[PDB]
Amino acid sequence: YGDAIPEVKAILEAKNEEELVTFTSRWSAEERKELRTQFQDTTGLEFIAFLKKCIKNGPYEDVMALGWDCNISARVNVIKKAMKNVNDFRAIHDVVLIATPDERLKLAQAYKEKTGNDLLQDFVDQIPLTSAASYLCHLAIRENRTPRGSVASDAEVLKHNLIDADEPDHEAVVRLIITSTADEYKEINHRFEVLTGKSVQEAIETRYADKENARGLCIAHYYNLAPARAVAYAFHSAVETQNDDMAYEQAARITGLFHDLHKFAWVHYACWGVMRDDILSRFQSKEANKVNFRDACLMFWKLA
């Protein structure tokens, strides 16, 4: 790290976003953490804040700042930003839906240590229970997965609420999905497809006109099938977003949080296209804070 510290300090001082990408590519998660520690010991500067001070704000900065951090710290930062003003359910969902029970516990602990408040209590105070999106937030952190031995009837509950009913029972749908074991859910999913001739994704996206709602339910659904499939869907949802500010914001977060943990998202993305090719095609902005995002994104996903 002795040579690498002055190397990256100089890259940052030059605002050389291109070289920052290639520099970052050299290091494992364990090495990034060690490098930040030594960087601060040697230079007196906390690495992430210095990176943000040097690199102009936007999605390129976001992907780098999230990607260089420890994953749980990154998640805490994302939740706080998401809840500061109008709740950004897309960001909260990414954090709490794409999470093992242990990741959930570690997030709760880190969030309490950082903010002095329990995550669940902040959800209680700041997220009224109305929409599917709101129920996903609360139930994701409250409820565990347990077998029910009712695969046929659970598939019927999904058909009834997603397709047949005048209005879905949002809480019942969220509870069903969030509390399903992976084994039972694979079976529920198949039975739903047989019963309806539709994918669960299609049924959700047809029913829920609010994009945050539809997206969050699809993430929870896909997580049950495979964690990296939820990540692939979320990435797809970013790619197909017409508004560049939003598409790049979402892609930066998803990449920063999940590029290592869910490295095989590209396997599941193949449903929609070749992930490498779509990153290249989609992220072509000339805006200064976006121009180098594509290359950062490819690097973090090992698709360069």
Q: Distance between CA 136 and CA 47 in Å, rounded?
A: 34
Same domain, 136 and 120: no
Residue numbers in the known binding site for Ca(2+) are 55, 61
Q: Given CA atoms 13, 71, 81, 292 in this order, what sign does their dihedral have? A: positive
Query: Is the CB of residue 74 less than 8 Å from the CB of residue 256?
Result: yes
Same domain, 79 and 90: yes
Q: Which candidate, 35, 115, 94, places its Cα nearest to that of 216? A: 94
The residues, any chain, with a CB within 8 Å of residue 117's CB and separated by 6 or more, are 111
Rounded to 5 degrees, φ, ψ at 35 are -65, -45
Q: Distance between CA 269 and CA 278 in Å, rounded?
A: 10
Same domain, 252 and 221: no
Token pair 């040579």: residue: 3
Same domain, 119 and 133: no
> Which CATH number characterizes residue 269's domain?
1.10.220.10
Which experimental method was this entry solved with? X-ray
Same domain, 192 and 258: no
Q: Distance between CA 195 and CA 211 in Å, rounded?
A: 25
Residue numbers in the known binding site are 55, 61
Q: Distance between CA 254 and CA 94 in Å, rounded?
A: 7
Same domain, 166 and 111: no
Same domain, 269 and 195: no
Residue that is last in its domain, among 24, 52, 69: 69
Range of the domain at 1: 1-69
Same domain, 4 and 50: yes
Same domain, 303 and 260: yes
Q: How many domains does the chain divide into? A: 4
The residues, any chain, with a CB within 8 Å of residue 195's CB and separated by 6 or more, are 155, 156, 159
Determine the 3-state secondary structure of 116 from DSSP.
coil
Residue that is last in its domain, among 127, 148, 163: 127
Same domain, 133 and 221: yes
In terms of DSSP H, where are the helices of 44-100? 47-54, 59-68, 71-84, 89-97
Same domain, 249 and 179: no
Residue that is last in its domain, among 168, 198, 225: 225
The residues, any chain, with a CB within 8 Å of residue 92's CB and separated by 6 or more, are 79, 82, 83, 137
